[PDB]
Amino acid sequence: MQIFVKTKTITLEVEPSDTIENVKAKIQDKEGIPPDQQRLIFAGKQLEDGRTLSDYNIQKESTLHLVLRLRGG
Amino acid sequence: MQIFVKTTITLEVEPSDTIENVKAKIQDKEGIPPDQQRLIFAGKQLEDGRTLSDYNIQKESTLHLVLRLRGG
Amino acid sequence: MQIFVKTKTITLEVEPSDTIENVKAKIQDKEGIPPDQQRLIFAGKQLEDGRTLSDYNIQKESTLHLVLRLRGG
């Protein structure tokens, strides 16, 4: 399934069973943002390592928001 | 309208002010760089692109500022 | 009371009236992780310094999660 990540916006190709760490790797692969500067938000919660996308009920064409941990908080 | 930021300063703000505009005003009064400000209201950490009224922050609401470097 | 902190789990010996800074000092005393690098989660909420354990309804055998600030949310 496709999900969107807005900081501009990128598309990721993901599966519900993917982890947050694994989503961050993909954002790196595409965007060059190191995983350890990424804060991901979905539906107003910051996502945490360990979980999967279905733990947050993230679904097709869900929109995530990336905030840089630098400064941005 | 007046709001309070406790770590306690007063700010003069408009419902339509953005969070980053609030942190700049904090900076101009306190010298704390926006990039080190964590603003909490009603148990939630505020995020840049929102406005005070997206959080129903109102006259004499009290926000809490934590420094990012202090952790939490 | 006993509570557990998972990142490796440690047991701390704490009172409900203890503060989050004090808990974090105890983690430091046992793990050497400095408190300004500790991010404590319980029941889905990041804990904040001005509160006590009872403000979070933390109790005997509650499980907290430590995330390092080196992340990445």
Six token digits for residue C1: 């009371």
List CB contacts of B16: < 8 A, sequence separation 6 or more.
Answer: B51, B52, B53
Residue with tokens 């929102």: B50
Six token digits for residue C21: 């800074």
Please tell me the total count of domains within chain B.
1
Sheet architecture: strand order including C45-46: C9-13, C2-6, C63-68, C38-42, C45-46
Phi, psi of B20 (to 5 degrees): -65, -25
Residue type, C41: I
Set of chain A residues whose Cβ sits within 8 Å of the Cβ of B35: 70-73
Length of chain B: 72
CB contact under 8 A, A36 and C67: no
Six token digits for residue A41: 């938000």
With 0-12 CB in 10 A as exposed, 13-18 as middle and 19+ as buried, what is A26?
middle
For residues A4 and C3, what is the distance between their CA atoms, to the nearest angstrom? 39
E strands, chain C, in order: 2-6, 9-13, 38-42, 45-46, 63-68
Candidate from A67, A70, A71 with C-beta closest to B47: A67
Set of chain C residues whose Cβ sits within 8 Å of the Cβ of A69: 72-73
For residues B72 and A32, what is the distance between their CA atoms, to the nearest angstrom? 28
Sheet architecture: strand order including B37-41: B9-12, B2-6, B62-67, B37-41, B44-45
Q: Which domain holds residue B44?
A: 1-72
C-beta of residue C64 within 8 angstroms of C-beta of residue C5: yes
Resolution in A: 2.0
In the PDB record, what is the listed experimental method?
X-ray
For residues C52 and C57, what is the distance between their CA atoms, to the nearest angstrom? 9
